[PDB]
Structures are given as structure tokens and as C-alpha cells.
Design a protein around this ligand. Sequence first.
Ligand SMILES: Oc1cc(O)cc(Oc2ccc(Cl)c(Cl)c2)c1
Length: 209
Amino acid sequence: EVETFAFQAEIAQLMSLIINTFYSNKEIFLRELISNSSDALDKIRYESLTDPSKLDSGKELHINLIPNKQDRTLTIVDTGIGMTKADLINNLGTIAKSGTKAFMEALQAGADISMIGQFGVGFYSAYLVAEKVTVITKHNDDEQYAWESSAGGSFTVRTDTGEPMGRGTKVILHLKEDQTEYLEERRIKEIVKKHSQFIGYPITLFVEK
Ligand SMILES: Oc1cc(O)cc(Oc2ccc(Cl)c(Cl)c2)c1
């Protein structure tokens, strides 16, 4: 069964700003999500140095980019540390609160939306291009969960009984109608090369059938 939660006030305010501000340089969403995946991969890689069994749920450390024109979705998959239920409901939003406040202050003082990563809240940049985001995640210490949000101030969390992923996170971006450029192989390649050139894990761009 699905549980529905309110976003913290400042996160809801940040998401409305992201959705409502006129800002053409939308492509930076992809950099932010790849950077989040790389950080999650660093985390499990470090933990495995002291406890090799943390990789029993999958030794490969990588990022896949999976466009689907038919469903109008771009999926970013990583085999990083993953997130617990408590992360999804409480921790991620709590940790993001100070960064959100700082970022919104910087935007009033002349910063632009592309600088969002410097405040550590880059995940929310997904709403530059997606009308709905689904996050499927599995941490070694918890069950597999699905977080989901179309913004408007709330998000849901439920257990995920779909195909078991082993460990990591899958972000499914349900793209806005006018943002289908981010499903084109040429465009994704261009963006990865521009902004994500030096990420230290293989990034595989899947091709469509
Ligand atoms: O794009 C990614 C990739 C990853 O491995 C982890 C990740 O973390 C977050 C951060 C904030 C929120 Cl709200 C959520 Cl749902 C998930 C984001």
C-alpha cells in the first residue's frame, strides 16, 4: 500500500521555483543526476573496502542511461549504495533543507538555476524536464522501495514488488511533452561529453530498438 507524504515547506517552494521559472538551460538536469549516481557509487565502493560482503548484492559499479521514446521516459540506473525507507521519507529531505534555503537566497542575489549542485540539492533539477519522477531503490539494509512525485507538494513511498535490482537506484524521468530531445542518442551523448566527461564509473548510453 502507498503512503503519501508532504514535502517540507522549503523543498516544495524550491520545486515550484524549478517548475515555474523561465530558464532555457534545462540540460544540466542530467549532470546533476549522474553526479548523484557517482556519489552513491563512491559510497558503496568505500564501504566495501572495510567489508567486501557489501558487494554480495552486485560487484559491478556503473551507470546506465536508458531512453524510451515509446514511454517517453529517460531512466538513469546506478549500482550505488541505494536508499533506505528512512532516507526516502526523512533523511534526504532533512539534509536538503539548509541547502535549499541557501540556494533560494543565492538566486535572489544573482545566481542561476545551473548552480543548484553547489548547494547539494541537484536532484530537484529533474523537474526542469520531467512532469513525474519515479525512484526505485534498494539498500543492502532494507527492502526495495519506490518513491514517486509529480510535485505539487507531495510524494509517495511504497514497497516495490517489481523486478529485484540487487542494489542501487533507478531514476525514471517521465518527460514533459516538449522535452523529448533528451531521448535522442545524439543529444544525450553531447550532454554527457559536455558536463560529465570525467565521471569515474562507466556510463553506458543504451540505444533504442
Ligand atoms: O539521482 C539520484 C541517484 C542516486 O543514486 C541517489 C539519489 O538520491 C536522491 C536524492 C534526493 C531524493 Cl528526493 C531522492 Cl528521491 C533520491 C538521486
